[PDB]
Every structure is written in C-alpha cells, then in structure tokens.
Write a protein that binds this ligand. Structure first.
Ligand SMILES: CCCCCCCCCCCCCCCCCC(=O)OC[C@H](COP(=O)([O-])OCC[N+](C)(C)C)OC(=O)CCCCCCCCCCCCCCCCC
Ligand SMILES: CCCCCCCCCCCCCCCCCC(=O)OC[C@H](COP(=O)([O-])OCC[N+](C)(C)C)OC(=O)CCCCCCCCCCCCCCCCC
Ligand SMILES: CCCCCCCCCCCCCCCCCC(=O)OC[C@H](COP(=O)([O-])OCC[N+](C)(C)C)OC(=O)CCCCCCCCCCCCCCCCC
Ligand SMILES: CCCCCCCCCCCCCCCCCC(=O)OC[C@H](COP(=O)([O-])OCC[N+](C)(C)C)OC(=O)CCCCCCCCCCCCCCCCC
Ligand SMILES: CCCCCCCCCCCCCCCCCC(=O)OC[C@H](COP(=O)([O-])OCC[N+](C)(C)C)OC(=O)CCCCCCCCCCCCCCCCC
Ligand SMILES: CCCCCCCCCCCCCCCCCC(=O)OC[C@H](COP(=O)(O)OCCN)OC(=O)CCCCCCCCCCCCCCCCC
Ligand SMILES: CCCCCCCCCCCCCCCCCC(=O)OC[C@H](COP(=O)(O)OCCN)OC(=O)CCCCCCCCCCCCCCCCC
Ligand SMILES: CCCCCCCCCCCCCCCCCC(=O)OC[C@H](COP(=O)(O)OCCN)OC(=O)CCCCCCCCCCCCCCCCC
Ligand SMILES: CCCCCCCCCCCCCCCCCC(=O)OC[C@H](COP(=O)(O)OCCN)OC(=O)CCCCCCCCCCCCCCCCC
Ligand SMILES: CCCCCCCCCCCCCCCCCC(=O)OC[C@H](COP(=O)(O)OCCN)OC(=O)CCCCCCCCCCCCCCCCC
Ligand SMILES: CCCCCCCCCCCC(=O)OC[C@H](COP(=O)(O)OCC[N+](C)(C)C)OC(=O)CCCCCCCCCCC
Ligand SMILES: CCCCCCCCCCCC(=O)OC[C@H](COP(=O)(O)OCC[N+](C)(C)C)OC(=O)CCCCCCCCCCC
Ligand code: SF4
Ligand code: SF4
Ligand code: SF4
Lengths: 176, 316, 156, 46
C-alpha cells in the first residue's frame, strides 16, 4: 500500500482564496510558529547537572577493560588467548609461561586502549570471566602513553572496580 | 556636568550589550529545552565578564592586509557610529535635543555600511570581498523602506523631532493607526542589522565579511552590532509604542519605556530561534517586489489621509 | 604587597577567564562527531559551561578532533591548527584520533592525530559517551587552571 | 517447577499508539481577520 504526501488540490472559492490572502498578508502561519517556541520557553529543560548528576546506564555497559580474580585471590586468566584471537582490532598482546608453582599464567597482558573499539568480544570469548569491560567511562588522560595498559594496570582496575563489576555480572549472566 | 552625562550614557550601553549576550544564550536555550550559561557565576551572571577578558588577552591575527589602515578604520567607524546614534534619544529627555533628530539617525545609520565595505577590502581575500558586497547590497536595499516608512509615520506627527513623537502618542499608540507600517518597519530593522532570518553574513554554508578578525578587534564589531540591536528597538518603541511622559515623575516614563524596549529586543531573540534562513535572492525579492510596492502605496495614503480628515499636525 | 602575590592572583584571573570561555572548533570527521552533537544536545548542554556549540577557526580556543584522520585529510588539519590564534589546545576524541583504532593498520589512515598536531587531552572510547567527552572537556578546564604563565615570567 | 520468564508484552497487548499527523485548526477566517484589521485602522485615524 502507498499514500500521497503532497497531492492536494486547493479550493478556489472566494472564502478559501481570501483565507490564503490573510495568511500571506498577516503572516498567520509564521506567528503560529512563534507560539510553539514560546511553549518550550515554559517547559522544564531536560538538562542534568553534571558532574553532580549522571546519565542513566545499564548493567551491560561496556567501559574500561579489567582483569578479575577468584574469591581466593588467584587470577582468573589462564592465558588461553581466545580474547587475543577474537579482538577485531588486535588490541591485545599476551605472553605466558609456567608459573613457579606450575600454573598456566600470563607474563604479559597488554591492551592498547587506542586500538580498542570497546566492542565486548574479549569478554564474550573468555571462558572464565577474566577480562571484562567495567562500568567506568571517565578515564581520559593527558598523554598518549597512559592509555597503553599492561597487566599491572589491568589488575589494579580489577581490584579497584570488583565491587561494582561483580554486581553487574550477577545482574546479567542469566542473559549470557 | 555634560561630560558626566556622556559617560552615564556610554558605559551603561556597553554593560547592557555585555549582558544581552548572556540573555540571548539563555532565552535560546530554554526555547531549545536546555538552560544556557548557569555555571560561570550564579545563573551565568559572570559569563559576559569571562568572555570579555578572554578576547582581549588572545593574540590577534592581522593578516597581510592590502592596506592595514582600513583594517583599523573599520571597527573604529562601526563602534563610533553605534554609540553616536544614542545621543538624540528621548528617555524622556535627550542628551542632545536635535530639531531633526529622526533625520540625524537616518544619516548616521547610512554611514555604517562603510565599515562593512572597508573590512572587505582590508581582508585582501577575493572571496571575503564577495561576502562584503552581498552584505552591503542588503543594507542599502532595506534602508529605502526605513526612510519611506519613517516619512509616512511623521506625516501623523508633523516634525522630525524625536520628542514630538511622545506628544503625538499622548492619547493612543501609533501602532493602532499604522500597524501595516509597523510590520514592515520591524522586519526592515532585522535586515539592516543582519539578524536571522536575514543573517547571510553569519549564515555559514553560503559565506561572513568579518571573518579575518579575532580577539579585541572582533569584539569591537560584535559590540557595535549588538548596540544597534538595542538602539533600533528603542527607536521602534518611541515610534510605535509611545510612553506617556509626566514632567514631575520622569522616572515613571523610563521604567515603562525600558520594559517596552526590552520586550522588543527579546522579540529579536525569539525570532532567531523560530525560523530558517532566507536565500540571498529571496530577501532581495522581499524588498523590491513586496515591501516597496506596499510602502510606496501607503506613503500615498498617508500623505492624503490627514488632508481629507482635517487632521494635519502642527508644524511646531 | 609583594610582586609574587600580585602575579599569583593575576594568573588566576587570566586562567579563570580562559577556562570559563572555551570556544571549540569541532572537526567532525566520522561517527565520533555524532556523540559530540549529543554533548550540545539538551541532556548535557555544553553551552551552560561557557562552551559554545560552534565556533569559527579564528575565534576558537580548542580543536576537537572527532573521527578518523586520513592521509588525504591531514594537511587540511595542520593548516587549520596553524591558523588558530593562541592560546590553543587540542582534544583527541575517540580511538581513531588517539591511535587509529579499528583502522590502525590501514594504508590511508594516520595512526593517531598526535603525530600531526600536539594533543592536550585524550578521550578514549569508540565512541566516547557524550558524558565522557564532557568529562574530558572539564579535565581540560582544570589543566588550564594549573597554568602559571605569569608566575614563570616573573622569575625569568 | 519454574516457568519461562522473558520480556513479553502484557496480556491483551499494549494500548493504542497515535501516529497520524494532528496539526489542528485555529484562528478566524480571512474575512474576519481583514475586518478586525480595517476596524483598528478606522479607530486609529479617528
Ligand atoms: C509572555 C506573554 C505571552 C503572550 C505573548 C503573545 C503571544 C503571541 C504568540 C502567540 C501565538 C499563538 C499561536 C496562534 O494561535 O496563532 C495561530 C493563528 C491562526 O493560525 P492559522 O494559520 O492556522 O489560521 C488559519 C486561518 N486563516 C486561514 C485565516 C489564516 O494565527 C493568528 O490568527 C494570528 C493572526 C494575527 C497576526 C497579526 C500580526 C500583525 C502584526 C501586529 C503587530 C502587533
Ligand atoms: C569626528 C569623527 C567622525 C564623525 C562622523 C560623524 C559626523 C557627525 C555628523 C555631523 C553633525 C550633525 O550631523 O549635525 C546635525 C545636528 C542638527 O541639529 P539641528 O538641525 O536640530 O539644530 C540644532 C540647533 N537648533 C535646533 C537650535 C537649530 O547638528 C547640530 O545639532 C549642531 C551642529 C554643530 C555643527 C558642528 C559640526 C562640526 C563637526 C562636523 C565635521 C565632521 C567631520 C566628519 C569626518 C569625516 C567622517 C564622515
Ligand atoms: C508578535 C511577536 C512580536 C511582538 C513584539 C511584542 C513585544 C513588544 C511589546 C508588546 C507589549 C506592550 C508592552 C507591554 C508592557 C509595557 C509596560 C508599560 O509600559 O505600562 C503599561 C502600559 C501603560 O501605558 P503607557 O505608559 O505606555 O502610556 C500609554 C499612552 N497613552 C495614554 C497615550 C495610551 O500599558 C500597557 O501596555 C498595557 C498592556
Ligand atoms: C481604509 C483604508 C485602509 C488602507 C490600509 C489597508 C491595509 C490593508 C492591509 C494591507 C496588508 C498589510 C501589510 C502587511 C505587510 C505585508 C508585507 C508582505 O510583503 O507580505 C508578504 C511577504 C512575502 O510574501 P510571500 O513570500 O508569501 O509571496 C509573495 C508573492 N509571491 C507569491 C508572488 C511571491 O511576507 C513577508 O514579509 C515574509 C515575512 C518574513 C519573516 C518575518 C517574521 C515575522 C515575525 C513576526 C513579527 C510580527 C510583527 C511585529 C511587529 C511589531 C511592531 C512593534
Ligand atoms: C567589564 C569587563 C572588564 C573587567 C576587567 C577586569 C576586572 C573584573 C574582575 C572580575 C573578577 C571575576 C573573577 C571571579 C572568579 C569567580 O567567580 O570564581 C571562580 C572560581 C569558582 O570555582 P571554579 O570556577 O574554579 O569551579 C567551577 C566548577 N564548579 C562548578 C564545580 C565549581 O573561583 C576560584 O577559585 C578562581 C579564583 C580566581 C581568583 C581571581 C582573583 C582576581 C583578583 C583581581 C586580580 C587583579 C585585578 C586587576
Ligand atoms: C466580499 C465578501 C463576499 C464575496 O467575497 O463574494 C462571495 C462570492 C461567493 O463565493 P464563490 O461562489 O466562490 O464566487 C467566486 C467564484 N468566482 O464570490 C464572488 O463571486 C464575489 C465576486 C468574486 C470577485 C471578487 C474579487 C475580490 C478580490 C478583489 C480585491 C479585493 C481587495 C480588497 C483590499 C485588500 C486589502 C485588505
Ligand atoms: C558590570 C560589568 C562591569 C564590572 C566588571 C566585573 C567586575 C565586578 C564583578 C563583581 C563580582 C566579582 C567579585 C569581585 C572579585 C572577587 C572574586 C573572588 O575573589 O573570588 C574568590 C573565590 C575563590 O577564592 P579562593 O577560594 O581563595 O581560591 C581558591 C582557588 N582554588 O571565588 C569563588 O569561587 C567564590 C564564589 C563566588 C565568586 C563569584 C562572586 C559572586 C558572583 C556575583 C554575581 C553578581 C555580580 C555580576 C553581575 C553584575 C556585573 C558586575
Ligand atoms: C478591488 C480592486 C483593486 C484594484 C485591482 C487590483 C489591481 C490589479 C493589478 C494587480 C495585478 C498586477 C499584475 C500581476 O499579476 O503582476 C504579476 C507579475 C509577477 O511576475 P513575477 O513575480 O516575475 O513571476 C514569477 C514567477 N516565477 O508582476 C509583473 O509582471 C509586473 C508587476 C509590476 C508591479 C509594479 C509595482 C509598482 C506599483 C506599486 C503600487 C503603487 C501605486 C501605483 C499608482 C496607482 C495610481 C492609482
Ligand atoms: C498577535 C497575537 C496572536 C493571537 O493572539 O491570536 C491567537 C488566536 C488563537 O485563538 P484560538 O483559541 O486558537 O481560536 C480558535 C477558534 N477556532 O487567534 C485568534 O483568535 C484570532 C484573533 C486575532 C485576529 C487577527 C486580528 C487582525 C490582524 C490584523 C490586525 C493586527 C494589528 C492590530 C493592531 C494591534 C495594536 C494592539
Ligand atoms: C469599495 C469600498 C472601498 C472603501 C471606500 C471608503 C470606505 C469609507 C471611508 C473610510 C476610508 C477612509 C478613512 C476615513 C477615516 C475616517 C475615520 C472615521 O471613520 O471617523 C468618522 C468620524 C465621525 O464623525 P466625528 O467628526 O468624529 O464626530 C464628532 C464631531 N464633533 O468622521 C470623520 O472621521 C470625518 C469623515 C471622513 C470621511 C472621509 C471619507 C469620505 C469618502 C467619501 C465617502 C464614500 C467612500 C468613497 C467611495 C468611492 C470609493 C472608490
Ligand atoms: C607596562 C606593562 C606592564 C609592565 C609590568 C612591570 O614592569 O611590572 C614589574 C613589577 C615588579 O617589578 P620587578 O620586580 O622589577 O619586575 C620586573 C619584571 N622582571 C622581574 C621579569 C624583569 O611587576 C609586578 O609587581 C606585577 C606586574 C603586574
Ligand atoms: C480596537 C478596535 C479594533 C477592532 C474593531 C472591531 C472589528 C470588528 C470585526 C468583526 C468581525 C469578527 O468576527 O470579529 C469578531 C471576532 C470573532 O469572530 P467571529 O465573528 O466569532 O468569527 C466567525 C467566523 N469563523 C467561524 C470563521 C471564525 O472577535 C474576535 O475574537 C477577535 C477580536 C475582536
Ligand atoms: S572491547 Fe573489543 S576491541 Fe576492545 S580489547 Fe575487548 S575485544 Fe578488543
Ligand atoms: S580469554 Fe580470558 S582466560 Fe583467555 S587469555 Fe583472554 S583473559 Fe585470559
Ligand atoms: S573512534 Fe569509533 S566512533 Fe569514533 S570515528 Fe573511530 S570508529 Fe567511529
């Protein structure tokens, strides 16, 4: 089905023709537009008072990558390199070797936060919920070099945001 | 004491222009469902002061102008004339009580085109010149209707004295007998001051002439432009919304007259937020094909109407 | 009064004026320009901080690079930067401008705008939220607040 | 025994949603607009 948008025939009776003469001379439809802007002048603005108020987000929000631990304190990552394989930007670099106790653990875990497209594939591929994107979105820097995270920066983030990260994963893991 | 009088007129004008920038940004904001400046001082009352200091300690460009003397003459002329158009305004007593004050304001207003033309030359850019030519052609075209409309109104007043317009409207506003002229006077003032929907200069995607100016020199063009917006709306209120004058309580006149002058200045900001922009060939046709035929016809009507009713005003 | 006291307060007056009236020139090159428009939208309203929506290159104090800088576009960017009257700051918005992002290994993309012009603030994300760019702008304000131009001239 | 729970519309569906253009009609006719305008002029001249 279809409909015409602009296929009307204006009437040519005297009253209709005089109606358009009053509109042309007395600027009726222009003053109709002034009234609409006047109404918005008396509506409550939608502005929020940042930084004291924040915009609503959801548990699925994708922000600053981070490395998590088990409740015992042991790292969750076991250097499987699935995240490094799936990262469409090749923003992840990993090196691993047997640990002193024989565990499969990384010796390098870097994310280039300037190559990263903040897509979330790294946390979908992870089989042990080790690399996650947290809820922090305010981490702008003053130099380019502060955005090249290494394993120490990522483990510090995980310890720093674990209280909020765990609650979000609790709220959404039933959809995953 | 006269020298004190001049300063009591100049400084408040500049302060009014300074806080008009704030009011414009906040009225536009609320018509757009937002707030506007409310962080720099309470309700953004220090925003104008921050902007002024920032511009005057920012390095200016001063490109390789073809003259380098027109580049400095243009803002002097613009600001110098903008302040001069205030001296005959009765509020309710003029600083200078001219007999031909209405004609003085036309004369000084027609000289403001040079600052537009000179700054075009100084920029040394061929394209910047084209923008100056379009702005100049707009200003001269729409001051044809300012002169004829003003003449039509004065036929019901009897003189070019600005304070006689107060006496003329001692029983009724001139908006009532001459509302068709008021409509075309109000729109003609928007075109003169390059205001939306007539701002092709500031209307990017088609052109402005004051593009090479930054810092203090740019602010001088800005201040002159906004002082003309207040002045023309003060002229309109005197012309079409006469305020009764009580010689024993002159402050009563000033309060009522200021409120009208503000409401007409806010109408300029209201109209900017509501409409799109005219095309260059379309605002020229709005003048040479719509306003001018009506203005000429109404001029004939207003020359004859006083005669055929026995209502010619006194010469004095 | 001491000279070191007048200079300290004069530095605070010029810093206050400069950080309270940042007029940005936005280079909207790619998707990151959309998020920059949402910072001007009613929800966040950059204008209420003194940050005007649009400014011309010669009336502007900060350049926001929002999108992918290609090799065919780089000379135009440097030209606009050189014509900005000083003081001038550059904010790098998004992964593309910071380091090339998703197109880092492309033949036609400059790997980071910081090898074409100096950069003061890097805003990460792809794209950064409109509340993340706003946080970066307010971080540039505090950086300007720490400037001590007059206190260093007085000790020369 | 726990039933399946996923986002679903309420029983009976959601209420109706308006989508058509609704620019209403306001103001007087051309004849009356011109009558009021001429009337104002006549009083002004008098
Ligand atoms: C703060 C104080 C609040 C009040 C401020 C004043 C309000 C002015 C704006 C209100 C606009 C309301 C919108 C509206 O109803 O207009 C639609 C109406 C109707 O819009 P319309 O276009 O649908 O009308 C259809 C009928 N015909 C075909 C005849 C046009 O507009 C008008 O009727 C206005 C006509 C009078 C305009 C005369 C202007 C001449 C200049 C006079 C100088 C003074
Ligand atoms: C100087 C910087 C550049 C100024 C440019 C603006 C020129 C001002 C206009 C001239 C004054 C005027 O309009 O008089 C009207 C008004 C007309 O008023 P009036 O017609 O109502 O009469 C006043 C007195 N009664 C009513 C009692 C008869 O003139 C006067 O009021 C007083 C006349 C004083 C004459 C002195 C003029 C000397 C200055 C002129 C030289 C200007 C050089 C310009 C340089 C080139 C730039 C263009
Ligand atoms: C359509 C959009 C554009 C329209 C622009 C509308 C803004 C221009 C102002 C229109 C409203 C008129 C001003 C009303 C507020 C003036 C306050 C005032 O002076 O006292 C009330 C004034 C008092 O009157 P008066 O002090 O001006 O003197 C009247 C003069 N006689 C006696 C000759 C009639 O009266 C009103 O305006 C009441 C309305
Ligand atoms: C008894 C004797 C009586 C004698 C006098 C009788 C007079 C009868 C009435 C005559 C008509 C009245 C003249 C009205 C002016 C018409 C001008 C015109 O050209 O109209 C067509 C023009 C253009 O007409 P057009 O573009 O639609 O088309 C023209 C013709 N064709 C189709 C061939 C191209 O309208 C405009 O002027 C455009 C307006 C631009 C936007 C202005 C924004 C308006 C904002 C609201 C301001 C409200 C006024 C505020 C005043 C405040 C004052 C204090
Ligand atoms: C007319 C225009 C020309 C004016 C000429 C210059 C003279 C005007 C002086 C105006 C001074 C305004 C400064 C007000 C600062 C303010 O409001 O607080 C800002 C700020 C307010 O905090 P804030 O702005 O940093 O934080 C904003 C963020 N939130 C919203 C979260 C708070 O206060 C400060 O701490 C800044 C200190 C500034 C000190 C300036 C002292 C100047 C003393 C005079 C020096 C010599 C003069 C010669
Ligand atoms: C006057 C009010 C009555 C009126 O206008 O006439 C109504 C009459 C009936 O309407 P209708 O059936 O449509 O006839 C038109 C068909 N040709 O319609 C008529 O037939 C009347 C005669 C039609 C021709 C009249 C032309 C009117 C326009 C002339 C210009 C009027 C200028 C007035 C000043 C304008 C400024 C305010
Ligand atoms: C008409 C234009 C012509 C005049 C040009 C303008 C000059 C007059 C301006 C008057 C208002 C400014 C008052 C005088 C200057 C004093 C400002 C000042 O010293 O504020 C200090 C205070 C911060 O000081 P401190 O805490 O010690 O430093 C911490 C640094 N991290 O700063 C603070 O944060 C305190 C918070 C209050 C600061 C703002 C002052 C109140 C705002 C008043 C608004 C009304 C005045 C503006 C409108 C009229 C125009 C002048
Ligand atoms: C009720 C009774 C009322 C009287 C009857 C009404 C008057 C009848 C004349 C009105 C019709 C005029 C002729 C006409 O329709 O002109 C239209 C034409 C527009 O052509 P154009 O705009 O170029 O086409 C664009 C298309 N894309 O335009 C033209 O081609 C030429 C138009 C020239 C108009 C000249 C305007 C100057 C005159 C202003 C009026 C001043 C009074 C004149 C002296 C009157 C003496 C009594
Ligand atoms: C300007 C103010 C515009 C205005 O107030 O008009 C709005 C009004 C809307 O009323 P509304 O409730 O929508 O009517 C629906 C009826 N079906 O619209 C109306 O009710 C129409 C009433 C005004 C009709 C226009 C009058 C003639 C216009 C030309 C003369 C205007 C100048 C008069 C002198 C002004 C000096 C004070
Ligand atoms: C197709 C029709 C086109 C329209 C035709 C003309 C319409 C009728 C005239 C109105 C238009 C002209 C404007 C005249 C303004 C007059 C204002 C008014 O109406 O006031 C009436 C007033 C009342 O008397 P007043 O003096 O106030 O009483 C107190 C004395 N102590 O008394 C006065 O004001 C003084 C009297 C003024 C009379 C002037 C008009 C006479 C014209 C001849 C009448 C015939 C109309 C023309 C016909 C040909 C049209 C082509
Ligand atoms: C005229 C333009 C301004 C000249 C300022 C000036 O000369 O101000 C000098 C004085 C102090 O004098 P001083 O200690 O000799 O500083 C001379 C400068 N040196 C030390 C860099 C050589 O600065 C003040 O107290 C604050 C100045 C406000
Ligand atoms: C200062 C003096 C100026 C006014 C002089 C008097 C003008 C007389 C005009 C009569 C025509 C008319 O209709 O005017 C009276 C009108 C009401 O319109 P209606 O008759 O119900 O419309 C009927 C036609 N419809 C159905 C198309 C709308 O009134 C008003 O609401 C306007 C303010 C008065
Ligand atoms: S969010 Fe996507 S692009 Fe960024 S590190 Fe994770 S997988 Fe790589
Ligand atoms: S997918 Fe998880 S476990 Fe595997 S290397 Fe990446 S972070 Fe470590
Ligand atoms: S950083 Fe992301 S959102 Fe911004 S331009 Fe590049 S791909 Fe688009």
């Amino acid at each position: 089905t279809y409909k015409y948008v602009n296929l009307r025939e204006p009437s040519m009776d005297m009253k209709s023709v005089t109606d358009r003469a009053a509109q042309t001379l007395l600027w009726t439809e222009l003053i109709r537009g002034l009234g609409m802007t006047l109404s918005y002048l008396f509506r409550e603005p939608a502005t929020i008072n940042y930084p004291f108020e924040k915009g609503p987000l959801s548990p699925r929000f994708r922000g600053e990558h981070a490395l998590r631990r088990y409740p015992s304190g042991e790292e969750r990552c076991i250097a499987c390199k699935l995240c490094e394989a799936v990262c469409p930007a090749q923003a992840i670099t990993i090196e691993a070797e047997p640990r002193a106790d024989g565990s499969r653990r990384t010796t390098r875990y870097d994310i280039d936060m300037t190559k990263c497209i903040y897509c979330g594939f790294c946390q979908e591929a992870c089989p042990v919920d080790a690399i996650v994107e947290g809820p922090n979105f305010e981490f702008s820097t003053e130099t380019h070099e502060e955005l090249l995270y290494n394993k120490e920066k990522l483990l510090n983030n995980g310890d720093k945001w674990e209280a909020e990260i765990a609650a979000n994963i609790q709220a959404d893991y039933l959809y995953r | 004491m006269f020298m004190i009088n001049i300063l009591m007129l100049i400084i408040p004008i500049l302060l009014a222009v300074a806080f008009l920038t704030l009011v414009e940004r906040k009225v536009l904001g609320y018509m757009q469902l937002r707030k506007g400046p409310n962080v720099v001082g309470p309700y953004g009352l220090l925003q104008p002061i921050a902007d002024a200091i920032k511009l005057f300690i920012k390095e200016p460009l001063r490109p390789a102008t073809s003259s380098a003397s027109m580049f400095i003459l243009a803002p002097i002329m613009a600001l110098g004339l903008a302040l001069t158009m205030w001296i005959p305004l009765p509020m309710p007593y003029p600083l200078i009580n001219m007999n031909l004050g209405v004609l003085f304001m036309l004369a000084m207003s027609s000289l403001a085109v040079y600052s537009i033309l000179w700054s075009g030359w100084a920029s040394n850019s061929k394209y910047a010149l084209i923008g100056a030519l379009r702005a100049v052609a707009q200003t001269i075209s729409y001051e044809v209707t300012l002169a004829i409309i003003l003449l039509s109104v004065l036929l019901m007043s009897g003189s070019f004295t600005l304070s006689t317009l107060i006496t003329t409207q001692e029983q009724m506003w001139l908006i009532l007998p001459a509302w068709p002229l008021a409509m075309m006077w109000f729109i003609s003032t928007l075109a003169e001051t390059n205001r939306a929907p007539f701002d092709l200069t500031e209307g990017e995607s088609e052109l402005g002439f004051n593009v090479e100016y930054a810092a203090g020199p740019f602010a001088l063009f800005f201040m002159a432009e906004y002082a003309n917006i207040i002045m023309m709306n003060i002229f309109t209120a005197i012309l079409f919304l006469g305020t009764s004058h009580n010689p024993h309580m002159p402050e009563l006149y000033t309060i009522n007259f200021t409120i009208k002058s503000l409401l007409l200045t806010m109408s300029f900001l209201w109209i900017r937020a509501s409409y799109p922009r005219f095309r260059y060939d379309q605002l020229m046709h709005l003048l040479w094909k719509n306003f001018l035929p009506l203005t000429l016809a109404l001029c004939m009507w207003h020359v004859s109407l006083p005669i055929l009713t026995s209502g010619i005003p006194p010469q004095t | 009064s001491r000279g070191e006291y007048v200079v300290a307060k004069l530095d605070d007056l010029i810093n206050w004026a400069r950080r309270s009236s940042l007029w940005p020139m936005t280079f909207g090159l790619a998707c990151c320009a959309v998020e920059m428009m949402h910072m001007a939208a009613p929800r966040y309203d950059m204008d209420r901080f003194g940050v005007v929506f649009r400014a011309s290159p010669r009336q502007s104090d900060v350049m926001i690079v929002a999108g992918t800088l290609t090799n065919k576009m780089a000379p135009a960017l440097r030209k606009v930067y050189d014509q900005m009257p000083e003081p001038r700051y550059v904010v790098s918005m998004g992964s593309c401008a910071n380091g090339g992002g998703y197109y880092h290994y492309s033949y036609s993309v400059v790997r980071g705008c910081d090898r074409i012009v100096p950069v003061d603030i890097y805003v990460p994300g792809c794209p950064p939220t409109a509340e993340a760019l706003l946080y970066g702008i307010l971080q540039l304000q505090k950086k300007i607040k720490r400037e001590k131009r007059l206190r260093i001239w007085y000790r020369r | 025994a726990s039933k399946v729970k996923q986002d679903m519309p309420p029983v009976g569906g959601y209420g109706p949603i308006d989508y058509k253009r609704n620019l209403p009609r306001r103001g007087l006719s051309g004849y009356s607009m011109f009558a009021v305008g001429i009337g104002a002029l006549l009083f002004g001249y008098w």
